[PDB]
């Protein structure tokens, strides 16, 4: 038979291993010839694997690169202008790769050029609350200072935005061993820890979903009109550069000024973690100078798009997508994901060559330039938005399959919760001690739901990956699954470093490729069910449950301000009424879904299921973030990686006690309650009987 | 049999007459108790006629009314402040209605209050080109003046916007007999002409599609958050009032200053049509003073929504809608339309009681507050946008059925051209001299296409009626049809006057109700075909033809500026390429549509037809007009009643030789060409094979 079990059994750990090795021998930086060659290879292989059509979709987008003959670095400079200490120009390359060319040195993509010189202020993780602590409590002024921040906790672009708005003239990002060095494990190449010369690359944009900074709204095709750089979306206005903890110790060790306010501001280096500004007495005339010469350049990128035409509903699309571009070798990020996609395509192709086709169309995507701001996925979705709007059933992401080997991590829409529970109960756990048990059992044991006994944790989608345009802009039900560590937004120690290699994975993460295989079964099984189940495998009742949880949560935030809610008559009654109505109507829809040979009622009902995520989209977008249109979820305004629920109301309430016109601030809270209550009711009504 | 002929044969002229009489005995002003009672009557009758469900949908929107105890009027005031002439406080009521209560006196709805006093300037029709002529050529400054303008040619709201931006402190609108008095016809009650005491009511908003001025984007339901009046959409900032030509002669006769620039500025009154400013020598110390005391008030309105559930595709909606609120008796506007809708519902109900149901769902709507800015239709569409987005096949409007008795007038999307041609070839002409001939024959003879031999004229949809939200905001294929005169945007003489009565229609327009019956057959036949045809009756190839015409036209406007197109490299190549591609893909889709027992391919193909109008929607809207989202058509920025093609490019090019930064202006032209080329290509691609 051709069923899910046939599909799953065809997946092989050994193939995933072969593909990972093949994808990680040379760097595949977006916009480089090597990454174009890999795109062509993937295209050719997906054709040989059996897909109906496999095309490259190219765009010309703004990318950023260091200048090869004018390198970026940071100095401590004495009063005579002698540079007495310089940060490294590159990470010491790993064993056997010391002769690999075209390793991009560490840099912060999209940093402007500049050579700012000044006094350092240490700002912990550079979070919103860290700047509150500095400015409001400690009375430390960052204006005209160079800020030094440790990576971790929030997306690095939010750190830069926070430093910019604090008046900083430059930002230095570094990896503290508190966050990037697990006690009792060896540094690469002898274990999976970050050495002191390791450095995390990464872009520092604040795109808010825009895609290519020059073409918001429209694909960056051959005739596209581009904004000038001054009007580009999301570029930082101050220079930024990342360094490792050997170099960071040299910058931090001389810091004076005020003591850290408490222990949560202290990392693991042998320094005081003084906040500054500037250095202690003897070194007080020394300064820090950045030298940043990177350039932004419009550059061609290439997505690979593979189609497996559906037998019955070819106009309904289930999409499996993940990126292909990497910072250097991409041993984990993204090739551990891309190798799993490659094997999934191979398995679907094997069934196809035997005469099988999925009920609905499956689209497979190898996205480019994800590392530079989700550019490949976003441009393609901008080009194809009308098709995706009207035909998109679901999107399953496929970045790194493993970021650890402890347990599964799933983030998805509530519409997929039941699908994920049912699928994981039918898969074998790969975990030591759970042989013969289900993946559901091991996952639930290791990552219990905080809400429900005997259920696993499933998180909200935020952003920082290629599902963003599909979910937050277009409102297509989306999900992701990967293996993870026991720091959830910080990344694993070797993230975006030259040390993320095939050997890292094969030696230290997954030598038997069993975790990769389990992730292939989860991602692949989800796509199989979404593309093949007669009734789409979405349970609207699961959205009703979470909407009540999110309403309770946002009401509880507001109720920290009872006097103001009395004064401005701030009521959540409409939102609770909408949620109650959604619960009622969803329950009745579920009964009809169980209770109907009629393909029109089926498809009418499948259309109701498919357009339910779509109904949470507001065509006017969220305030000042027009590309985040989903009213229930958006990436947190303080941390792109985290999802926030009822984001319009959440941001209206955030730090509201600081606003100088409380009448206006609370009016905007009420406006957001109305928009949310209306959207929930309108989504509910899409599930009512149609006439 | 139950087929279109059965439906059409059931329609009766005598019933339409009975309904028109019933709907026009008392005023039905939006927000009044009389109009709520009529809503309840219509609801009850549509239920008895056989509809499955008939509900009222109410909203609380901003309306505007004169103050009953402080009337609006205009004076000529002498230097001592004696008001030596006053305009009328009401129109002399028509015979037998002199005791009707609650006739709203003439006023301009949404005028602010004020008592501005000043010198008059006469501005012809107050069009953009009239202000260009005054300000640029004649060097006349309207700042701080009261402008007097004749009604006609463009929507009165555009006149007010133009006067406001010229710096006017008040606007007086009047009906000139040149535009509102047909030579050789008697004034009401002895014929259909406007008497000198007649006055045209009408709102003067510039909503640009927003709906209720206080709740743009969202329905004005019970919990809605409202803007403050200062942030309301579309309200004028200067007082405005309309008068008849007896009163206008008294204001114009003393005008001095400069002579009218040419004869196109002279109407038919025995005055010089001096442009001013101010009065001739002897009266130069006299001024004009307005006294406006109207109030804006949030008021409940009621739509009636009737559903006839489809037998096969109940989740596909064909909508027949038109307004019910009138300024006074609504003898033509809108009850000549509403009576036709009532008879159409009655006829569909007759088939339904015999066991018939249409294939798709038909929704029937009696909209409220159309006269105050399309408020009822727009609020309901805001409430139901997700349902309409995903399920809306077509919208057919149904305002006034007759505005004359000369020939048919059809405005619609190109997708309906073939439907309209085919239907009119099967209907009998009601015209004298064409007995036994088709309506297509009489219509084509009387209103020949300017493009094609042996075809009738069909115009572009603009706005000024309830199809706006469906077509320009939501992108649902829309059409309208009515009988008209041989002044196309000016209205008929008694438009929005107390004289628009049942007797006006019965005596002077359509005594045998044969024109009303013909319009019922056209509107009703269109709804029948849209709701019943197996394949939706849309021909995508007709859109390809018009897109080329519109591309040629916009290129020709640009080519008035060859040096600038050379300098700024302004190319229309992408737009022509998109149009060529749309033509090719549409031709291939049409072949497949002819060449496919498979209901999924059918419905897939019907979905492609239904979503083709939707594909012309840009979710970012047009510049500064977020509710006009269709890229091919928008209401003209100079005349809400007229449609403009490629409006984004058209407005970027308008008066471009006057812009002080030509580089920026031409850059925006290029940006609009890219948006249009992309949208045309994206719409084309929705017709490609789906996978
Ligand atoms: C959840 O679903 C329920 C339906 O089960 C839905 O209930 C609706 O609530 C609205 C808003 O409260 C009701 O609106 C009322 O409608 C009647 C006419 O039917 C009006 O007369 C009422 O207005 C009067 O009273 C108001 C309140 O005191 C006054 O402000 C006003 O000036 C009038 O005096 C009022 O508009 C509506 O009838 C029900 N519909 C039902 C029961 O079918 C509820 O709105 C849904 N929740 C959300 C968030 O949508
Ligand atoms: C109408 O439909 C046609 C398809 O029938 C479609 O044609 C496409 O045109 C684009 C834009 O011209 C082509 O883009 C080229 O793609 C190749 C790879 O296939 C690239 O190598 C080309 O780039 C080079 O040349 C450019 C121009 O000189 C340079 O600017 C660039 O730097 C490169 O050197 C170029 O991107 C595309 O291949 C075809 N697709 C086909 C034929 O299938 C056309 O775009 C449609 N019209 C609209 C408005 O969409
Ligand atoms: C990764 O695998 C691919 C596919 O097997 C290899 O590319 C092939 O290499 C052979 C030998 O040079 C060529 O003849 C084929 O044309 C290639 N096939 C393609 C591109 O589809 C590639 O060499 C492998 N890369 C590494 C680094 O091992
Ligand atoms: C840090 O790097 C800088 C730049 O390369 C070094 O300073 C330069 O030294 C050279 C040769 O001695 C001089 O000709 C340049 O004028 C210097 N450039 C600048 C910008 O100062 C510096 O010596 C290095 N510091 C350390 C400690 O290695
Ligand atoms: C997950 O599996 C459960 C258990 O099989 C499914 O729930 C059953 O679905 C069938 C078919 O509708 C019903 O007859 C049963 O009553 C359901 N059992 C329950 C609710 O306990 C559920 O549909 C599956 N989820 C999917 C497919 O998304
Ligand atoms: C318009 O027609 C309607 C419906 O025939 C009339 O309303 C009915 O009037 C009778 C007699 O008063 C009542 O018993 C019914 O309750 C009404 N039916 C309804 C409202 O559905 C109405 O009187 C007519 N109006 C005019 C001005 O002729
Ligand atoms: C135009 O109307 C105004 C307002 O009613 C008239 O002026 C008023 O006359 C009364 C009684 O004679 C005075 O008590 C008021 O003080 C006047 N009001 C104002 C505002 O001036 C005026 O007479 C009318 N003009 C004509 C020609 O009929
Ligand atoms: C309008 O009527 C024409 C003439 O009947 C229809 O065109 C015909 O459609 C049938 C069915 O597809 C074809 O087999 C013929 O070749 C067509 N004749 C032509 C193009 O001259 C046309 O489809 C009708 N328009 C509608 C229904 O919107
Ligand atoms: C990079 O630096 C070199 C050497 O100083 C310089 O000549 C060139 O302008 C720079 N390249 C850029 C900005 O692309
Ligand atoms: C901080 O720095 C600059 C001093 O140049 C000053 O303009 C700014 O107002 C200061 N802000 C606070 C809050 O102290
Ligand atoms: C993989 O699992 C084993 C068992 O805990 C351990 O040796 C190793 O630390 C894990 N690797 C990583 C990268 O967590
Ligand atoms: C209308 O005018 C009367 C009489 O002058 C006045 O008392 C009242 O305030 C006005 N009504 C309004 C503004 O609604
Ligand atoms: C017209 O009127 C006012 C005079 O008060 C002046 O401020 C304005 O600049 C004038 N404009 C032109 C174009 O003459
Ligand atoms: C109706 O038609 C006849 C014939 O031309 C004519 O008496 C009359 O002017 C027409 N009525 C109107 C309002 O045009
Ligand atoms: N490849 S990844 O680490 O999962 N995503 C990248 C890019 C994310 C973004 O730009 O939103 C990052 O977080 O730096
Ligand atoms: N009833 S009608 O005359 O066709 N439409 C009204 C309202 C139009 C509008 O506000 O857009 C008018 O033109 O004044
Ligand atoms: Ca773009
Ligand atoms: Ca509204
Ligand atoms: Cl992922
Ligand atoms: Cl109409
Ligand atoms: Zn990644
Ligand atoms: Zn990454
Ligand atoms: Zn009307
Ligand atoms: Zn009207």
JSON list of N, CA, C and O in Angstrom, two decimals, chain B residues 84-108:
[
{"chain": "B", "resi": 84, "resn": "UNK", "atom": "N", "xyz": [-30.29, 91.99, 3.78]},
{"chain": "B", "resi": 84, "resn": "UNK", "atom": "CA", "xyz": [-31.23, 92.56, 2.79]},
{"chain": "B", "resi": 84, "resn": "UNK", "atom": "C", "xyz": [-31.85, 91.54, 1.84]},
{"chain": "B", "resi": 84, "resn": "UNK", "atom": "O", "xyz": [-32.87, 91.83, 1.20]},
{"chain": "B", "resi": 85, "resn": "UNK", "atom": "N", "xyz": [-31.25, 90.36, 1.75]},
{"chain": "B", "resi": 85, "resn": "UNK", "atom": "CA", "xyz": [-31.84, 89.27, 0.99]},
{"chain": "B", "resi": 85, "resn": "UNK", "atom": "C", "xyz": [-31.54, 87.97, 1.73]},
{"chain": "B", "resi": 85, "resn": "UNK", "atom": "O", "xyz": [-30.43, 87.83, 2.23]},
{"chain": "B", "resi": 86, "resn": "UNK", "atom": "N", "xyz": [-32.53, 87.10, 1.84]},
{"chain": "B", "resi": 86, "resn": "UNK", "atom": "CA", "xyz": [-32.35, 85.76, 2.43]},
{"chain": "B", "resi": 86, "resn": "UNK", "atom": "C", "xyz": [-32.80, 84.67, 1.50]},
{"chain": "B", "resi": 86, "resn": "UNK", "atom": "O", "xyz": [-33.88, 84.79, 0.90]},
{"chain": "B", "resi": 87, "resn": "UNK", "atom": "N", "xyz": [-32.00, 83.60, 1.41]},
{"chain": "B", "resi": 87, "resn": "UNK", "atom": "CA", "xyz": [-32.39, 82.40, 0.67]},
{"chain": "B", "resi": 87, "resn": "UNK", "atom": "C", "xyz": [-33.53, 81.67, 1.39]},
{"chain": "B", "resi": 87, "resn": "UNK", "atom": "O", "xyz": [-33.79, 81.89, 2.59]},
{"chain": "B", "resi": 88, "resn": "UNK", "atom": "N", "xyz": [-34.22, 80.83, 0.63]},
{"chain": "B", "resi": 88, "resn": "UNK", "atom": "CA", "xyz": [-35.40, 80.12, 1.11]},
{"chain": "B", "resi": 88, "resn": "UNK", "atom": "C", "xyz": [-35.08, 79.17, 2.26]},
{"chain": "B", "resi": 88, "resn": "UNK", "atom": "O", "xyz": [-33.97, 78.61, 2.34]},
{"chain": "B", "resi": 89, "resn": "UNK", "atom": "N", "xyz": [-36.06, 78.95, 3.13]},
{"chain": "B", "resi": 89, "resn": "UNK", "atom": "CA", "xyz": [-35.89, 78.00, 4.25]},
{"chain": "B", "resi": 89, "resn": "UNK", "atom": "C", "xyz": [-36.39, 76.61, 3.87]},
{"chain": "B", "resi": 89, "resn": "UNK", "atom": "O", "xyz": [-36.15, 75.64, 4.60]},
{"chain": "B", "resi": 90, "resn": "UNK", "atom": "N", "xyz": [-37.07, 76.50, 2.72]},
{"chain": "B", "resi": 90, "resn": "UNK", "atom": "CA", "xyz": [-37.58, 75.20, 2.27]},
{"chain": "B", "resi": 90, "resn": "UNK", "atom": "C", "xyz": [-38.01, 75.28, 0.83]},
{"chain": "B", "resi": 90, "resn": "UNK", "atom": "O", "xyz": [-38.23, 76.40, 0.31]},
{"chain": "B", "resi": 91, "resn": "UNK", "atom": "N", "xyz": [-38.12, 74.12, 0.16]},
{"chain": "B", "resi": 91, "resn": "UNK", "atom": "CA", "xyz": [-38.67, 74.08, -1.20]},
{"chain": "B", "resi": 91, "resn": "UNK", "atom": "C", "xyz": [-40.20, 74.09, -1.12]},
{"chain": "B", "resi": 91, "resn": "UNK", "atom": "O", "xyz": [-40.77, 73.39, -0.28]},
{"chain": "B", "resi": 92, "resn": "UNK", "atom": "N", "xyz": [-40.87, 74.88, -1.98]},
{"chain": "B", "resi": 92, "resn": "UNK", "atom": "CA", "xyz": [-42.34, 74.84, -1.93]},
{"chain": "B", "resi": 92, "resn": "UNK", "atom": "C", "xyz": [-42.81, 73.39, -2.15]},
{"chain": "B", "resi": 92, "resn": "UNK", "atom": "O", "xyz": [-42.41, 72.74, -3.14]},
{"chain": "B", "resi": 93, "resn": "UNK", "atom": "N", "xyz": [-43.56, 72.81, -1.21]},
{"chain": "B", "resi": 93, "resn": "UNK", "atom": "CA", "xyz": [-43.84, 71.39, -1.40]},
{"chain": "B", "resi": 93, "resn": "UNK", "atom": "C", "xyz": [-44.79, 71.12, -2.58]},
{"chain": "B", "resi": 93, "resn": "UNK", "atom": "O", "xyz": [-45.61, 72.00, -2.94]},
{"chain": "B", "resi": 94, "resn": "UNK", "atom": "N", "xyz": [-44.68, 69.91, -3.17]},
{"chain": "B", "resi": 94, "resn": "UNK", "atom": "CA", "xyz": [-45.48, 69.62, -4.36]},
{"chain": "B", "resi": 94, "resn": "UNK", "atom": "C", "xyz": [-46.97, 69.44, -4.04]},
{"chain": "B", "resi": 94, "resn": "UNK", "atom": "O", "xyz": [-47.33, 69.16, -2.89]},
{"chain": "B", "resi": 95, "resn": "UNK", "atom": "N", "xyz": [-47.83, 69.54, -5.06]},
{"chain": "B", "resi": 95, "resn": "UNK", "atom": "CA", "xyz": [-49.29, 69.44, -4.85]},
{"chain": "B", "resi": 95, "resn": "UNK", "atom": "C", "xyz": [-49.74, 68.17, -4.10]},
{"chain": "B", "resi": 95, "resn": "UNK", "atom": "O", "xyz": [-49.36, 67.05, -4.50]},
{"chain": "B", "resi": 96, "resn": "UNK", "atom": "N", "xyz": [-50.54, 68.35, -3.05]},
{"chain": "B", "resi": 96, "resn": "UNK", "atom": "CA", "xyz": [-51.08, 67.23, -2.29]},
{"chain": "B", "resi": 96, "resn": "UNK", "atom": "C", "xyz": [-50.14, 66.74, -1.18]},
{"chain": "B", "resi": 96, "resn": "UNK", "atom": "O", "xyz": [-50.54, 65.87, -0.40]},
{"chain": "B", "resi": 97, "resn": "UNK", "atom": "N", "xyz": [-48.92, 67.28, -1.15]},
{"chain": "B", "resi": 97, "resn": "UNK", "atom": "CA", "xyz": [-47.90, 66.95, -0.12]},
{"chain": "B", "resi": 97, "resn": "UNK", "atom": "C", "xyz": [-47.54, 68.17, 0.74]},
{"chain": "B", "resi": 97, "resn": "UNK", "atom": "O", "xyz": [-46.55, 68.11, 1.50]},
{"chain": "B", "resi": 98, "resn": "UNK", "atom": "N", "xyz": [-48.23, 69.29, 0.53]},
{"chain": "B", "resi": 98, "resn": "UNK", "atom": "CA", "xyz": [-47.97, 70.49, 1.33]},
{"chain": "B", "resi": 98, "resn": "UNK", "atom": "C", "xyz": [-48.20, 70.28, 2.86]},
{"chain": "B", "resi": 98, "resn": "UNK", "atom": "O", "xyz": [-47.80, 71.13, 3.66]},
{"chain": "B", "resi": 99, "resn": "UNK", "atom": "N", "xyz": [-48.82, 69.16, 3.26]},
{"chain": "B", "resi": 99, "resn": "UNK", "atom": "CA", "xyz": [-49.05, 68.83, 4.69]},
{"chain": "B", "resi": 99, "resn": "UNK", "atom": "C", "xyz": [-48.24, 67.61, 5.16]},
{"chain": "B", "resi": 99, "resn": "UNK", "atom": "O", "xyz": [-48.39, 67.10, 6.27]},
{"chain": "B", "resi": 100, "resn": "UNK", "atom": "N", "xyz": [-47.36, 67.13, 4.30]},
{"chain": "B", "resi": 100, "resn": "UNK", "atom": "CA", "xyz": [-46.47, 66.09, 4.73]},
{"chain": "B", "resi": 100, "resn": "UNK", "atom": "C", "xyz": [-45.47, 66.70, 5.74]},
{"chain": "B", "resi": 100, "resn": "UNK", "atom": "O", "xyz": [-44.94, 67.80, 5.55]},
{"chain": "B", "resi": 101, "resn": "UNK", "atom": "N", "xyz": [-45.28, 66.00, 6.85]},
{"chain": "B", "resi": 101, "resn": "UNK", "atom": "CA", "xyz": [-44.32, 66.44, 7.83]},
{"chain": "B", "resi": 101, "resn": "UNK", "atom": "C", "xyz": [-42.97, 65.74, 7.61]},
{"chain": "B", "resi": 101, "resn": "UNK", "atom": "O", "xyz": [-42.85, 64.73, 6.84]},
{"chain": "B", "resi": 102, "resn": "UNK", "atom": "N", "xyz": [-41.97, 66.32, 8.27]},
{"chain": "B", "resi": 102, "resn": "UNK", "atom": "CA", "xyz": [-40.66, 65.74, 8.32]},
{"chain": "B", "resi": 102, "resn": "UNK", "atom": "C", "xyz": [-40.04, 65.76, 6.94]},
{"chain": "B", "resi": 102, "resn": "UNK", "atom": "O", "xyz": [-39.27, 64.87, 6.65]},
{"chain": "B", "resi": 103, "resn": "UNK", "atom": "N", "xyz": [-40.37, 66.73, 6.09]},
{"chain": "B", "resi": 103, "resn": "UNK", "atom": "CA", "xyz": [-39.54, 66.93, 4.89]},
{"chain": "B", "resi": 103, "resn": "UNK", "atom": "C", "xyz": [-38.27, 67.68, 5.32]},
{"chain": "B", "resi": 103, "resn": "UNK", "atom": "O", "xyz": [-38.35, 68.84, 5.76]},
{"chain": "B", "resi": 104, "resn": "UNK", "atom": "N", "xyz": [-37.12, 67.04, 5.21]},
{"chain": "B", "resi": 104, "resn": "UNK", "atom": "CA", "xyz": [-35.88, 67.68, 5.58]},
{"chain": "B", "resi": 104, "resn": "UNK", "atom": "C", "xyz": [-35.61, 68.87, 4.63]},
{"chain": "B", "resi": 104, "resn": "UNK", "atom": "O", "xyz": [-35.65, 68.70, 3.41]},
{"chain": "B", "resi": 105, "resn": "UNK", "atom": "N", "xyz": [-35.38, 70.07, 5.18]},
{"chain": "B", "resi": 105, "resn": "UNK", "atom": "CA", "xyz": [-35.10, 71.16, 4.23]},
{"chain": "B", "resi": 105, "resn": "UNK", "atom": "C", "xyz": [-33.76, 70.96, 3.51]},
{"chain": "B", "resi": 105, "resn": "UNK", "atom": "O", "xyz": [-32.90, 70.19, 4.00]},
{"chain": "B", "resi": 106, "resn": "UNK", "atom": "N", "xyz": [-33.57, 71.62, 2.36]},
{"chain": "B", "resi": 106, "resn": "UNK", "atom": "CA", "xyz": [-32.28, 71.49, 1.67]},
{"chain": "B", "resi": 106, "resn": "UNK", "atom": "C", "xyz": [-31.11, 71.83, 2.58]},
{"chain": "B", "resi": 106, "resn": "UNK", "atom": "O", "xyz": [-31.12, 72.85, 3.31]},
{"chain": "B", "resi": 107, "resn": "UNK", "atom": "N", "xyz": [-30.09, 70.98, 2.53]},
{"chain": "B", "resi": 107, "resn": "UNK", "atom": "CA", "xyz": [-28.86, 71.21, 3.30]},
{"chain": "B", "resi": 107, "resn": "UNK", "atom": "C", "xyz": [-27.78, 70.35, 2.69]},
{"chain": "B", "resi": 107, "resn": "UNK", "atom": "O", "xyz": [-28.09, 69.42, 1.94]},
{"chain": "B", "resi": 108, "resn": "UNK", "atom": "N", "xyz": [-26.53, 70.64, 3.05]},
{"chain": "B", "resi": 108, "resn": "UNK", "atom": "CA", "xyz": [-25.39, 69.82, 2.59]},
{"chain": "B", "resi": 108, "resn": "UNK", "atom": "C", "xyz": [-24.97, 68.98, 3.79]},
{"chain": "B", "resi": 108, "resn": "UNK", "atom": "O", "xyz": [-24.44, 69.49, 4.75]}
]
